[PDB]
């Protein structure tokens, strides 16, 4: 009914967590406070999370003695103090995360309007509020923290039942679960749902998947991660495979990377699209296999470091997007040599479209445009990644990503705890070695959340990584 070894290893784990968390959080406070580079709005919130996590670790020694002994040695007064400091830091931790996500939501979705809300001085007022609000929310712990006898004949520091009624303890569980966990997370996740809706709503990412085969041979096409796709084809008839946009527009730039462009015979690596009113079919060909497409020569365009020929053809009794035996016109621009592949590359489409209307080639009802692999009576392989361009900087994409991962780790560490607590309300007082270790574990997992954050910043933020290596990496 008691496992001294299983108790000792858990007391050891408490102490390891305390150390790892005080190192990393001290490191995070130092680099933000010392270096000019780190003075960013987001880092005002991280600093406060770091100060909260730092103070959180300071209570761990006291609590480890209670894990090892199932006894509180330091009297009633220090019990109230530790429970009160512990609580303030618990709730300032998650309220900081909440405000931080609200800040990310404002930056992505309403950047122009909240130029005034994202000044350093008001983020400093916001964080002072966060500490104030926490102090109010933990007033119950303040009042009712105390000592309780246990079955071993010892005293535990816990929260005493107010008025000795299991009803008020139960209400306090519900209170802490709603304010400390459910309401912040609901705010954070709605914020991030609006962020990801918004981003996809821009043109930064592709939103269409083309995988059309007429039917002969094998066209093995993988719809990969994000804007990436691959195709393996052999002894085919006509096929076209690519990624792009469900509605095309003549002002969009297109970026791509042909990690593989390995045609064995006729296959075009090209941008491809249709229109209606009138029904035309357009191409900007950057590379090909054993055959270069052609038509009536009308001119040239220079773009993206290469020169293209302009061509036109006219199909009749030919397959379209409208019907199978229809008539339509094709507008080609075809590079003069094969553009190299294996590195990022642009197609500034409003260049090509303007030059066509010059030569009388003019495209109303827009249809899809994709960066495609086309083939005919050939074999080969390609691998391509496709993406627009954005108005928001890669540095702020990286910060916004990082907070989301910090939020996902928070959930992983604090959910077992709240699930146990909601259980405990249900008369679970059968203290057992199996459930008593379960409790000690599920609690130390909330503390280990403060160790993960500094490590998270080192792998997901370059400036935190550069600052850390500045301290930890020795030169001469
Ligand atoms: C009220 C909780 C709290 C205090 N402050 C809060 C602030 C917000 C939300 C809840 C709190 C506090 N719960 C408790 O006291 N009990 C006592 C009774 C326990 N029980 C049963 O009823 N049947 C059992 C059968 C087998 C085993 C245990 C059993 C479970 C719940 C707590 O979780 N205290 C932590 C400190 C962690 C505080 C988080 N920062 C603790 O004591 O951790 C050590 C010292 C390792 C034990």
Numbering used by the authors: 37 to 239, 1000 to 1159, 1161 to 1184, 243 to 331
Reported in the publication:
Somatostatin (SST), an inhibitory hormone that distributes widely in both human central nervous system and periphery tissues negatively regulates multiple hormone releases (growth hormone, glucagon, insulin, gastrin and cholecystokinin) and cell proliferation through SST receptors (SSTRs). There are five types of SSTRs, namely SSTR1–SSTR5, which are divided into two subfamilies: SRIF1 (SSTR2, SSTR3, SSTR5) and SRIF2 (SSTR1, SSTR4) based on phylogenetic, sequence homology and ligand binding profiles. Here, we report five structures of SSTR2 and SSTR4 in different states, including two crystal structures of SSTR2 in complex with a selective peptide antagonist and a non-peptide agonist, respectively, a cryo-electron microscopy (cryo-EM) structure of Gi1-bound SSTR2 in the presence of the endogenous ligand SST-14, as well as two cryo-EM structures of Gi1-bound SSTR4 in complex with SST-14 and a small-molecule agonist J-2156, respectively. The overall structures of SSTR2 and SSTR4 possess the canonical seven-transmembrane (7-TM) architecture with an extended helix VIII in parallel with the membrane.
